[PDB]
């Protein structure tokens, strides 16, 4: 109804505050952090880096983040719980599947995938009793046969629980179009769905058409500009506000503190390019929008009200 | 030299006894057993099935099994430890990488992979303190660039620690030949390598040439015969490869196993029920069916003991 499951337990809508809806503590692979923690220096070093990063975002106003790391991104909810407590920042955990499913997942039916997503929402993740509050899915432009099963399983899990769905897309391939078609074929309401990485395109008519159908538009790669400037990506926010779709916007950094599912030392490159980390949205994008004339009430609606409406489990 | 790592700690080689060198408690994926235990009914149901099966294997004479499940086969060494203690059967754990490495492994250099394998051999697996006693690798006929990195990392770890390497191959592709060439380019002795799934072929020329070089030949798919779609040979025809290799003078290069398991999520659903209804003996298939079949064919008892006890001991002893 109006309670959201976090890694520390359920919270009410009003407790969520300023929420970043697409983030990671650690981008990895299933089993990897526990099998090879020295890849990150140590588990303690990674935890301490994440706590400093969250404590800084908190000092910039952030009160909640949604960690959209799935099973196959190496989600370690025990890590999330530890860092959430030390930082005093709410963390919402995810179920779903990203782009690296192991064989034991790739060979499952849509019915089996539905049961796994439902277990993580309704019973808990692993043996921790921590329940997921969002379902994360991913496709690569043209949806593969397995990715279609994942999206349908995600829709069915969302329909049984009211928990929202958030996606990874290739925006340059207009990948949200095929995602939306599958979701609607399942009877999922677009207001339960965020089409993510949408700021990777300049095609405003693609974004507006999705927003016009009721989808949330995830503009979460603003600090990933590395030819368009981050200011140019951020102007997509103002463009959608001006078209009257302020209610459909979600904003985030898609940041992380460890990253093993990429080449070695990528985290050092990323941190040198965006030293603000997860504080980039509150420290840079929000003042940029206020200076371009966006009023405080609109910015509060995007960063507080929109994520509350999105994360609150709803079947209406 | 004479001590090997098991999931219960170090043992002397003389305590290994009758050893099955290619087995699995559970064939899965990294993280999967802990995230979705109800795929196997429950973690408790799976442990109890493994304990029952290992107990029947022990009654048939088995004293040690080598679980060649890697990280990416979802190896859960805490489960291996629990079932080894409850069945009172030695289990040797594995490091290495099989055919399903996640991105965090696929993107690593040969140097990084070497450190990972050395971590699991010299320090321990995850935070358990349990150390691997063997390195498992896998290729699919034509070795991929990343698979070549894994084989070179495995050879370097083996040279640093002395623990052996065992492989997954497509014997129909004669895959052991490309593996051996990579291993020998790293200076690894063939006596430290088992070429596995070798009973998937009839090509005695291919098998004897590897054995003549000092490689161990893993004949580990005998009870997989009656599983159709792949192969039409009976398990008796597969077992006669053991007799064939003995007759050519290569008894010291033979390792025999079941490649069985008690849970199997890295395959289509309900495969475990098909496998168990076809081979109800499970891991006891080798001691209960194959060994008497071979003794009937005139193979001396002391040759069979050499194959099931002596060859595994020489292979697993850290040597170098
Ligand atoms: C884990 As990602 C770089 O696809 O948001
Ligand atoms: C896990 As297997 C079927 O390659 O021995
Ligand atoms: Zn993504
Ligand atoms: Zn992400
Ligand atoms: Zn194999
Ligand atoms: Zn195997």
UniProtKB/TrEMBL annotation, chain A:
Gene Ontology cellular component annotations, sorted alphabetically: plasma membrane
Major localisation: membrane
Catalyzed chemical reaction(s): An aryl dialkyl phosphate + H2O = dialkyl phosphate + an aryl alcohol
Binding site residues for Zn(2+) 1: 22, 24, 136, 254
InterPro entries according to UniProt: AryldialkylPase_Zn-BS (IPR017947), Metal_Hydrolase (IPR032466), Phosphotriesterase (IPR001559)
Record carries keyword Endoplasmic reticulum: no
Cross-referenced Pfam families: PTE
Cell compartment(s), UniProt: Cell membrane
Family according to the record: Belongs to the metallo-dependent hydrolases superfamily. Phosphotriesterase family.
UniProt function note: Has an unusual substrate specificity for synthetic organophosphate triesters and phosphorofluoridates. All of the phosphate triesters found to be substrates are synthetic compounds. The identity of any naturally occurring substrate for the enzyme is unknown. Has no detectable activity with phosphate monoesters or diesters and no activity as an esterase or protease. It catalyzes the hydrolysis of the insecticide paraoxon at a rate approaching the diffusion limit and thus appears to be optimally evolved for utilizing this synthetic substrate.
Record's protein name: Parathion hydrolase
Native organism: Brevundimonas diminuta
């Amino acid at each position: 109804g109006d309670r959201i499951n976090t890694v520390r337990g359920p919270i009410t809508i009003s407790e969520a505050g300023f929420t970043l809806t697409h983030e990671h503590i650690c981008g990895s692979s299933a089993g990897f952090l526990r099998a090879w923690p020295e890849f990150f220096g140590s588990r303690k070093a990674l935890a301490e880096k994440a706590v400093r990063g969250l404590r800084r975002a908190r000092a910039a106003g952030v009160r909640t983040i949604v960690d959209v790391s799935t099973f196959d991104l190496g989600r370690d909810v025990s890590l999330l719980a530890e860092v959430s407590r030390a930082a005093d920042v709410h963390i919402v955990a995810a179920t779903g599947l990203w782009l690296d499913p192991p064989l034991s997942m790739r060979l499952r039916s849509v019915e089996e995938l539905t049961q796994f997503f439902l277990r993580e929402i309704q019973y808990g993740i692993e043996d921790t009793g921590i329940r997921a509050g969002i379902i994360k899915v991913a496709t690569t432009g043209k949806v593969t046969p397995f990715q279609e099963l994942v999206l349908r399983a995600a829709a069915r899990a969302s329909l049984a629980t009211g928990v929202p769905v958030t996606t990874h897309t290739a925006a340059s391939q207009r990948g949200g179009e095929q995602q939306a078609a599958i979701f609607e074929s399942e009877g999922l309401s677009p207001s339960r769905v965020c089409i993510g990485h949408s700021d990777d395109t300049d095609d405003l008519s693609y974004l507006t058409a999705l927003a016009a159908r009721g989808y949330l538009i995830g503009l979460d790669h603003i600090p990933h500009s590395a030819i368009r400037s981050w200011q140019t990506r951020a102007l997509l926010i103002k463009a959608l506000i001006d078209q009257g779709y302020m209610k459909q916007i979600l904003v985030s950094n898609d940041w992380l503190f460890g990253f093993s599912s990429y080449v070695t030392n990528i985290m050092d490159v990323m941190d040198s390019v965006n030293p603000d980390g997860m504080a980039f949205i509150p420290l840079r994008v929000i003042p940029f929008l206020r200076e371009k004339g966006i009023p405080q009430e609109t910015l509060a609606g995007i960063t507080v009200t929109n994520p509350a409406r999105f994360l609150s489990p709803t079947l209406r």
